[PDB]
C-alpha cells in the first residue's frame, strides 16, 4: 500500500516520534520531468535535422520542389541526406558507404506500388532505389491539416489533475510538422533496407508480404535506443473488421 512509515528516537529512548508518507505525487513528478526532457530531446533532434536541410539552397519552399517534376537532382539529394541522418541516429558514427548509389522517380500510377512509396533493388550489380513523386505530392496535399483539436485523457484526478498544475526565413510550423511525415516514411523504408541488406531475399519477400514478423529479427538487433514511437496508443477500432 506504500504508506511508508518513519520513526525517530532520541538517545536513551527519551522520546519517539512517527510520521508517514507515500511515493504518490513523487512518482508523478518523476514521470513529468522524464517525459518533459525526453520530448525536449526529440524536439531538439527534429530542429537539428531541419536545420541541416536548411543548408541545401532552398530557392523554393519544400512543397514547390515536388510540385515540380522537371527536376530529379534536388529530390534525390534530399532523399539521400534523409537516409544519412537516419543511419547516423542508428550509428553514432558519421560515415559513407558503398560509394555508388542511384535513384529513379517513378511517375505513373501504373508504375506505383501499394503501401510503400519507396523501394530498393539491393544489388542490380549495385544498389538502386525508386520513389513515387506522385504519391509524395498526394501526401503533400496538406489541406488536410488543422491544429485545433483535443487530446484523449483518463482518470485525471489520479492521473492528470496533478499534471494540471504546471507550466528572413522565419518560417511557420505546419510545413515543418509535415517533415515528420517523410521522416517516419523513410524510417519504415530503412527498416526493410537494413533488413535485406543484412539478410536474405527470402526475408525480403517476407517483411513485404507483411511487415509483422520482422520484430523477431529486430530482437537482439535494435541498437538499445528508441526511435520516434513515444505516444503508446496508435490504433483504431479493430473488432469491427466485420468479415
Amino acid at each position: 500500500c506504500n504508506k511508508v512509515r518513519t520513526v525517530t528516537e532520541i538517545v536513551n529512548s527519551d522520546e519517539k516520534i512517527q510520521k508517514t508518507y507515500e511515493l504518490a505525487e513523487f512518482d508523478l513528478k518523476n514521470l513529468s520531468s522524464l517525459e518533459s526532457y525526453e520530448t525536449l530531446k526529440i524536439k531538439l533532434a527534429l530542429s537539428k535535422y531541419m536545420a541541416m536541410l536548411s543548408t541545401l539552397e532552398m530557392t523554393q519552399p519544400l512543397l514547390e520542389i515536388f510540385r515540380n517534376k522537371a527536376d530529379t537532382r534536388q529530390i534525390a539529394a534530399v532523399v539521400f541526406s534523409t537516409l544519412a541522418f537516419i543511419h547516423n541516429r542508428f550509428h553514432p558514427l558519421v560515415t559513407n558507404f558503398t560509394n555508388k548509389m542511384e535513384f529513379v522517380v517513378t511517375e505513373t500510377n501504373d508504375t506505383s506500388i501499394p503501401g510503400e512509396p519507396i523501394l530498393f533493388t539491393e544489388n542490380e550489380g549495385v544498389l538502386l532505389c525508386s520513389v513515387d513523386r506522385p504519391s509524395i505530392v498526394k501526401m503533400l496535399s496538406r489541406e488536410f491539416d488543422t491544429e485545433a483539436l483535443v487530446n484523449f485523457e483518463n482518470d485525471n484526478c489520479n492521473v492528470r489533475i496533478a499534471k494540471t498544475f504546471g507550466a528572413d526565413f522565419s518560417i511557420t510550423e505546419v510545413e515543418a510538422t509535415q517533415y515528420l511525415t517523410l521522416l517516419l516514411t523513410v524510417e519504415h523504408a530503412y527498416l526493410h533496407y537494413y533488413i535485406f541488406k543484412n539478410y536474405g531475399v527470402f526475408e525480403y519477400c517476407k517483411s513485404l508480404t507483411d511487415h509483422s514478423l520482422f520484430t523477431n529479427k529486430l530482437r537482439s538487433t535494435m541498437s538499445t535506443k528508441t526511435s520516434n514511437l513515444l505516444l503508446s496508443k496508435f490504433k483504431f477500432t479493430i473488432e469491427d473488421f466485420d468479415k
Binding site: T8, F26, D27, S33
Partner: protein
C-alpha cells in the same frame, strides 16, 4: 571556478562568553527533540525528492542501514569531558 575568496585564514573565538551565556537562556524551554524532528524530517524528505527528480532507484534499506545508525552503550564506567566553570 571563481567563487572563492580564499585565504581568509581566521581562527575566530569571539569570546562574548557571559553575554552569550545569558542570551542562551531564553532558548532553554524550547522542546529540543520535538524541534529537532522538524529538521530531520525535512532533510530526509528533500533527499527523497531529489532521487525521484532524477528518476533514480533508491535503497531505502541502505539509507536506514547508514544514516543516523545507532551504536550501543555497553560500558560499566565513567569518563572525563569538556566543561566550562563559568564565573
Amino acid at each position: 571556478p571563481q567563487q572563492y575568496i580564499n585565504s581568509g585564514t581566521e581562527i575566530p573565538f569571539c569570546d562574548d562568553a557571559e553575554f552569550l551565556n545569558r542570551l542562551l537562556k531564553h532558548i532553554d524551554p524550547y522542546p529540543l527533540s520535538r524541534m529537532y524532528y522538524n529538521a530531520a524530517n525535512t532533510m530526509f524528505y528533500t533527499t527523497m525528492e531529489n532521487y525521484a527528480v532524477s528518476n533514480c532507484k533508491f535503497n531505502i534499506e541502505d539509507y536506514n542501514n547508514i544514516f543516523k545508525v545507532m551504536e550501543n552503550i555497553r560500558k560499566h564506567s565513567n569518563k572525563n569531558s569538556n566543561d566550562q566553570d563559568e564565573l
